[model samples]
Target: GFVNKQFNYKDPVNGVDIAYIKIPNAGQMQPVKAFKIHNKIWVIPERDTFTNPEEGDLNPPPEAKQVPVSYYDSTYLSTDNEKDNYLKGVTKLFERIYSTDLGRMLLTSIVRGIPFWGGSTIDTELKVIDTNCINVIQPDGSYRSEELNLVIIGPSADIIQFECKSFGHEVLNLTRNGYGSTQYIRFSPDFTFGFEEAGKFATDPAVTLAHELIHAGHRLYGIAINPNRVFEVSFEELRTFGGHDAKFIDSLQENEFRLYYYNKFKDIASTLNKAKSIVGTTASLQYMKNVFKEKYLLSEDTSGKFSVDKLKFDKLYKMLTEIYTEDNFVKFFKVLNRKTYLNFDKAVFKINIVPKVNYTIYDGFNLRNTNLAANFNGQNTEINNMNFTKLKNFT
Candidate 1:
């Protein structure tokens, strides 16, 4: 006497119970079915009998987010051969472009730039995973993907060799609604990496891995040290803000997952038994704030910082050639996080007119700012690193 609706028909020669599972929690129902041919577990039968939906559920939902791509040249040099050194130089380079993680929280700004510029997508999220833990491919084909991961494929066994962006895709058409729904992602692996540049570092395979990762992969874990001023919402926050719909549930599947994170103990753990040196820690999340202004968000563009060329390639190219190390690279990115200004401490310069008869130079609300000294007249007022504590005595 189950409510809702039910269909019970054991086809005259229906497929045997090769697969049926207990739904979790209630364990009453499961959404899939498989079958056996020889009665035991191994012999699997082919799936030919299938009915397609004639009704079109074309009511697609709006996209949840948009992601974009940015470009930069690799600054790898032949001279800097140390793995530690190269990681720093190259890491500083893109940081070669976006984060290394396709992972959700593994990085906060995989797309880079604020108000992340890109094509849009319906609310769909999934834990990024590249290789599988075990074989889930059915004997007759058709992959059986699990919930916490996304399974990527290539030109269906039909098309011998279909390829795109250096690789073939596993797709067709989305219904604009359900699982194969176009109501979502452009499925865009949009990117800015040129094969020539990316090839310099890894082989066609590793480069391919890098491509999926740059566009979409869970191979590595990356931390996007971003500034709060750059964007209003963090990718970490946005990835989960959607409703309990398919997109929301899918997206939350597992990127925040811990098992496969790149920050493994052997990587950052201290075997040196050394005390922590807090040298102004953390990577930088600084990006183009002026992008908001340039795009006409004047109300939010109080800083007015615009630059199509800050560390513009040539500058970047020269900088890349500099000597570097992993530690240096880690700290260098941090420099971009905080806006530094040329600060100047207010000088209470007392003109020794007579005895204690000194005229104190006070610029009203003078305290400290980004100037050497209030360049007084023709005097050599540039006290480069002049100790203001000593200058206070010159009064």
Candidate 2:
């Protein structure tokens, strides 16, 4: 856990995501026996049960607790309890991770994309909305609720009807603490609660949170913002072969082929992602500049302040990539493939597997499966299912 003491960190403009705090698997302490289970970072071997919370519900406390044992079955090997254990771990991990400014922001992990400029312009009210039942009062006090529908509004104050199907994750403009910002949306970690039937759902809360943050970035800064991170409708008939476009078809429906499918050379993607997570964002940039000797800045602004232009941001990103070049990624890959401890002076969060420390995965290096052949009217789409797995020798 970290401290909440306010520091001198600053944001670009005002609401842009200028800070990002990355937590590499801090590596298990000598006696602590740390490891991964599913998408959680566990500090011990025994599992604690939890029941994933429902959306629009209260926030789960982050502190870890004993799963009252009553959930146990005959031999005490309760499957439901195991699932609850996973969710509780997630809740606790979220709590620990949210102890700082960047960590708190990261809890909205869905759309924290690293655009060259900054993170995202999507300011997070970051509370639960998404009132699923039309009859109940949502936290925001809106009289009506639309779990899957939307009403867009411009600054003139009339909510618009131009709408689309959102898979629970959305950015809506709403009345804030005092101001009415542009079309607004708030995110909830309970995002997956209603997507499936009530109380029955599927999601790696840790990863889902991170993935949705990218949507937040995409909505505010990049392309491919909406449409459930999947294909929505048929413009054409056939589909793309290699890049299963997420625009027309849904990712979950498509077996997650394009979004997170990992296989050969996939480590290249993971490595670059590590570099991004490691040396990324305005937050880390300033931290590195202040802490490390090498200057992280290039040219000064005309007003003698640090510049915030995209060109410089790109350069800064390039500077980082150069240091953690694919060459090193190859090196790290070799160690991981050996199923051994990598000698690098770094820890994964390390997405993580430590050399000789953690044996298998809950920490991921890869994934499986393949494709989308949804052919349509305006645009033909084909999502090539990349069924890449671990190279034989590497494991």
Q: For candidate 2, report its TM-score.
A: 0.23
- 168-273: candidate 2 lDDT, tens digit per residue: 2234222111111111222122112101111111222233332332223222222222223322332111121111222344435333322221121132222222
Residue 278, candidate 2: alpha-carbon lDDT: 30
* Prediction RMSDs, each to the true structure: 29.6, 20.7
Q: State in Å the error of residue 380, model 1.
A: 58
Per-prediction TM-score, please?
0.17, 0.23
Report the lDDT tens digits of candidate 1 across residue range 12-46: 21322233321112222223332221111111111
Lowest summed lDDT window (length 10), candidate 1: 176-185
> Per-model C-alpha lDDT, please?
0.20, 0.23
